Design a protein around this ligand. Structure first.
Ligand SMILES: C[C@H]1CC[C@@H](O)[C@H]1NC(=O)[C@H](Cc1ccccc1)C[C@H](O)CN1CCN(C(=O)c2cnc(N3CCN(C)CC3)c(Cl)n2)C[C@H]1C(=O)NC(C)(C)C
Lengths: 99, 99
C-alpha cells in the first residue's frame, strides 16, 4: 500500500499472538517496542536516541507479521513512548520511500 | 526517486545557502538540525526523543531545498546526533512509503 505522511504512518503488527499498532520509522535502525515479555529470552542492550540513552531488552529471531507479510528479526523492548518499526524489519517487507 | 532502507535514507538539503546531509525520518513529526544559527529569529521549544526531553531553538518559515524541490517550513536547531527531516517538510515534497 502507499502511505502518506499527513498523519503518523501507523500500521498493525502481530507479535506473540496479539495485535498492536506501531509507527513506521525510517530513522530508527532498530525496532523498539513498549516494555513487555516476549516468548523467548533476551540480552541487555543500550540504544542512543535524541536526548539520551535507554537500556532495552534485546530479543533475537522473533516472528512478527507486518501487514500480512510474515517477517523474522530482532526486536528491542523498553520504555519507549511508542512502538517503533525500524529499518531492520522494514527492509524485509520491501518498504521504500518515494518522492 | 525510489529509496530503499538497506542503508540509512540520507539526502542532501540546502538550507541557509549551504548544503548538508540529512536523514529522512518518518517517525519525526518535526525537522531537527544540529546546532547552528540560521538567518532568522528563533523562539524556545522542548521536544522529546526516545532518550528524553531536549531544548531546541524553533525557527519559523525557513526555506529549504530537499534535492531539487524548494519548500518552506519550521526547522528546529538543537543537540541532535544527526540532521533529520521529519514529516512536516516530507509531505511538501510528496514523500510516501510503499510496500
Ligand atoms: C529509535 C532508536 C533506535 C536506534 C536509533 O536509530 C534510534 N533513533 C531515533 O530515536 C531517531 C533519531 C536518531 C537518529 C540517528 C541516531 C540517533 C537518533 C528518532 C526517531 O526516529 C523518532 N522518535 C520516535 C519516538 N518518538 C515519539 O514517538 C514521540 C512523539 N511525541 C512525543 N510527545 C508526546 C505528545 N506531546 C504533545 C508532544 C511530545 C514524544 Cl515524548 N515522543 C520520538 C521520535 C523523535 O525522535 N521525534 C522528534 C520530533 C522529537 C525528533
Amino acid at each position: 500500500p502507499q502511505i502518506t505522511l499527513w498523519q503518523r504512518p501507523v500500521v498493525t503488527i502481530k507479535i506473540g499472538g496479539q495485535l498492536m499498532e506501531a509507527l513506521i520509522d525510517t530513522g530508527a535502525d532498530d525496532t523498539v517496542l513498549e516494555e513487555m515479555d516476549l516468548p523467548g529470552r533476551w540480552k541487555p542492550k543500550i540504544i542512543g536516541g535524541i536526548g539520551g540513552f535507554v537500556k532495552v531488552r534485546q530479543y533475537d529471531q522473533i516472528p512478527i507479521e507486518i501487514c500480512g507479510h510474515k517477517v523474522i528479526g530482532t526486536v528491542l523492548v523498553g520504555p519507549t513512548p511508542t512502538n517503533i518499526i525500524g529499518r531492520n524489519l522494514l527492509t524485509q517487507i520491501g518498504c521504500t520511500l518515494n518522492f
